[PDB]
Amino acid sequence: STGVPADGGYTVIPELNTEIMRMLTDESTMRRICTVKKISSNEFKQLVSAGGATVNHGEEGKTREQTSTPQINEVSIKLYPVYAYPRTTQEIVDFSDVDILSWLTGEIGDTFTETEESDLVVGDGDKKAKGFLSVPRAEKNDKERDFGTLQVIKPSESLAWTSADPLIDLKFALRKKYRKNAVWVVNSTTAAKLQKVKNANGDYIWRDRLQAGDPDTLLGLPVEYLEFMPDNVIALGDFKRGYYIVDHETGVRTRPDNLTEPGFIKIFTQKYLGGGVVDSNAIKILELPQD
Amino acid sequence: STGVPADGGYTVIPELNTEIMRMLTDESTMRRICTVKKISSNEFKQLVSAGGATVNHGEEGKTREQTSTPQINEVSIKLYPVYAYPRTTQEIVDFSDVDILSWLTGEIGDTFTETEESDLVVGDGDKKAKGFLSVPRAEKNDKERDFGTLQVIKPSESLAWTSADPLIDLKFALRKKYRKNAVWVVNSTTAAKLQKVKNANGDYIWRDRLQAGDPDTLLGLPVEYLEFMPDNVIALGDFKRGYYIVDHETGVRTRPDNLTEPGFIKIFTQKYLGGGVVDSNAIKILELPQD
Amino acid sequence: TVNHGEEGKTREQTSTPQINEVSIKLYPVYAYPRTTQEIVDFSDVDIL
Amino acid sequence: ADGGYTVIPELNTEIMRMLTDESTMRRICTVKKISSNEFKQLVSAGGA
Numbered sequence: 001s002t003g004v005p006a007d008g009g010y011t012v013i014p015e016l017n018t019e020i021m022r023m024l025t026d027e028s029t030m031r032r033i034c035t036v037k038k039i040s041s042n043e044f045k046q047l048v049s050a051g052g053a054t055v056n057h058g059e060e061g062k063t064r065e066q067t068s069t070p071q072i073n074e075v076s077i078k079l080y081p082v083y084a085y086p087r088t089t090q091e092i093v094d095f096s097d098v099d100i101l102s103w104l105t106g107e108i109g110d111t112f113t114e115t116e117e118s119d120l121v122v123g124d125g126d127k128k129a130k131g132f133l134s135v136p137r138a139e140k141n142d143k144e145r146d147f148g149t150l151q152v153i154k155p156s157e158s159l160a161w162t163s164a165d166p167l168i169d170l171k172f173a174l175r176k177k178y179r180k181n182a183v184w185v186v187n188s189t190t191a192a193k194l195q196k197v198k199n200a201n202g203d204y205i206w207r208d209r210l211q212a213g214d215p216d217t218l219l220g221l222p223v224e225y226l227e228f229m230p231d232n233v234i235a236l237g238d239f240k241r242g243y244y245i246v247d248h249e250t251g252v253r254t255r256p257d258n259l260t261e262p263g264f265i266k267i268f269t270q271k272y273l274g275g276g277v278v279d280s281n282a283i284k285i286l287e288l289p290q291d
Numbered sequence: 292s293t294g295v296p297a298d299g300g301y302t303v304i305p306e307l308n309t310e311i312m313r314m315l316t317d318e319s320t321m322r323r324i325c326t327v328k329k330i331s332s333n334e335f336k337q338l339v340s341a342g343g344a345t346v347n348h349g350e351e352g353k354t355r356e357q358t359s360t361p362q363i364n365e366v367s368i369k370l371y372p373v374y375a376y377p378r379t380t381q382e383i384v385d386f387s388d389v390d391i392l393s394w395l396t397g398e399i400g401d402t403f404t405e406t407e408e409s410d411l412v413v414g415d416g417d418k419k420a421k422g423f424l425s426v427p428r429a430e431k432n433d434k435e436r437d438f439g440t441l442q443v444i445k446p447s448e449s450l451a452w453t454s455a456d457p458l459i460d461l462k463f464a465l466r467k468k469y470r471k472n473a474v475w476v477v478n479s480t481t482a483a484k485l486q487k488v489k490n491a492n493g494d495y496i497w498r499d500r501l502q503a504g505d506p507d508t509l510l511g512l513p514v515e516y517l518e519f520m521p522d523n524v525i526a527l528g529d530f531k532r533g534y535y536i537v538d539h540e541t542g543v544r545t546r547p548d549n550l551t552e553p554g555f556i557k558i559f560t561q562k563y564l565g566g567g568v569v570d571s572n573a574i575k576i577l578e579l580p581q582d
Numbered sequence: 583t584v585n586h587g588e589e590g591k592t593r594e595q596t597s598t599p600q601i602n603e604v605s606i607k608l609y610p611v612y613a614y615p616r617t618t619q620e621i622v623d624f625s626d627v628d629i630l
Numbered sequence: 631a632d633g634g635y636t637v638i639p640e641l642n643t644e645i646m647r648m649l650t651d652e653s654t655m656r657r658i659c660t661v662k663k664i665s666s667n668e669f670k671q672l673v674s675a676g677g678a
Contacts, residue, residue: 013641014335015334017328017336020340020363023572024344081349082348083347084345085355088633096637104360104361108344112346115346188465192460203490204496208497208509210510212511212512270349270355311601333589362631364631372586372588374587377595377596418588
């Protein structure tokens with residue numbers, strides 16, 4: 001029996017699945033909702049015209065006066081090296097059936113996706129991608145607010161977690177231009193807190209109004225959750241326009257660096273991540289008081 | 292008339308439908324929601340990387356420090372013989388129009404599906420598949436909780452059967468990684484109790500919000516019910532990743548064993564069932580107090 | 583049923599599943615309307 | 631933990647069998663291939 005090792009138990013080898021299960025794998029929602037511009041430079045300058053172009057509605061037989069020429073703004077999204085430098089022993093890389101080189105590159109790529117969802121959201125911008133939350137916020141409309149700052153809605157705790165008013169405010173803070181292809185961005189804990197909001201009567205506001213085949217939505221817009229957001233913080237926008245993820249044209253470049261310290265192979269797999277707010281009017285932030 | 296046996300009543304034979312109706316037949320929801328890995332071994336080792344890979348967000352002109360190499364975990368899913376050994380009389384197997392060999396193999400296959408839904412859920416693991424419920428549970432988040440243990444949510448009886456808070460907690464305990472292809476797992480009695488939850492006002496929380504063509508869902512995710520769950524226990528996860536059903540490469544192997552005791556044919560039809568939690572972060576358990 | 587046998591244990595007898603009989607008997611459901619031959623002949627809408 | 635489970639031990643399929651002692655007796659002694667249970671060799675016991 002297999003229970004006794006000596007009685008034919010050593011013969012039975014455990015069939016190790018050669019494909020290691022990468023627990024932390026996820027399709028990068030940042031790279032899907034936001035545009036990806038492969039570039040070859042340290043800094044990427046997208047030109048974002050603020051506006052100001054006007055018409056005077058001229059009459060038949062009136063001198064056509066000068067109209068104001070529209071303005072342009074600079075968004076200087078600088079790329080920075082996001083890297084991981086694990087020093088695997090050459091022993092494992094040789095003594096293996098599950099391919100440690102490919103497995104570790106996959107793990108570090110998943111780590112890159114995680115740190116993209118971290119830097120492109122919360123990332124302060126200190127030699128890394130400046131997340132839209134780290135971008136300074138201003139509670140003003142698109143006409144009054146300065147460019148490069150996001151409209152933030154900050155209601156009181158009363159109507160914050162009791163009613164849909166903050167989220168409706170967040171939805172219609174966006175213009176139709178962005179609401180056509182907008183998407184919600186909520187933390188999982190903040191999402192749970194949102195689904196639990198109950199008015200003075202007691203009924204839920206967001207009454208799980210979905211079908212089986214429906215993707216998770218909120219006020220008629222899809223919700224791509226980002227796990228690295230701070231608690232009780234929400235975002236919403238046309239992140240295709242709203243945010244630029246500037247990857248370098250080389251992308252992930254995994255030199256194994258086997259000669260630096262023999263007996264060890266050190267996968268470097270550095271990538272150049274950049275991120276920035278583009279069309280600051282295309283993303284809206286909603287801060288909610290902590291319960 | 293047919294009423295009197297002698298007056299042409301013996302001529303009328305009852306047309307026995309040669310296809311026996313197997314009452315207990317059901318498409319195995321376990322084998323569909325969970326992955327099936329046909330294997331040739333006593334033990335199946337899937338490698339489940341816990342994580343821990345990090346990046347330091349290096350600057351331009353800074354020495355690139357060492358990052359922590361990610362970890363791997365072992366899930367030792369051992370296969371065990373699940374069998375049934377019915378001793379049919381050779382008399383019936385010969386004296387029959389409905390094929391008793393095929394009918395009995397179908398009945399024992401349905402029994403195997405039932406005992407899969409039992410072992411892969413509640414099964415303690417004593418020389419059988421260890422169900423995800425029998426796997427030890429811990430009320431902690433994915434970061435703090437030990438691997439190989441499932442996040443269990445245990446609210447008080449007040450908000451358990453009055454509000455959707457436990458189920459929303461269960462939904463967003465999963466990460467987006469799993470919520471993309473997640474599925475609910477509820478007992479039929481527990482499902483009925485869930486559909487009956489009514490807040491302090493009296494209105495139902497889950498207001499049968501479905502269409503005719505919609506599969507039964509809950510918080511925007513499908514619900515594949517398992518009948519062998521304990522009362523007032525719920526599960527939810529990406530069971531493709533969350534649970535591994537390790538069948539042996541031979542599968543069901545039905546030797547009829549006609550020589551062991553003549554006058555009797557003893558279908559053995561043993562299979563090697565194994566089951567285990569894989570990505571303990573991909574399944575979430577919700578315990579609710581008994582009413 | 584299954585006994586969930588171990589490695590190195592005698593495989594005990596499991597209970598053979600049962601069968602039930604549902605004797606669905608057919609019976610004559612009929613209607614015997616006596617239409618006049620007059621209408622069946624004198625008609626444009628086909629009475630038959 | 632960190633890549634040690636990765637290392638499967640390469641177990642050899644063909645098990646080496648203990649080398650037995652060359653079947654000495656049936657080389658030495660005379661071997662008979664009978665179709666019965668008994669072989670009965672009549673021998674001269676002397677006494678003449």
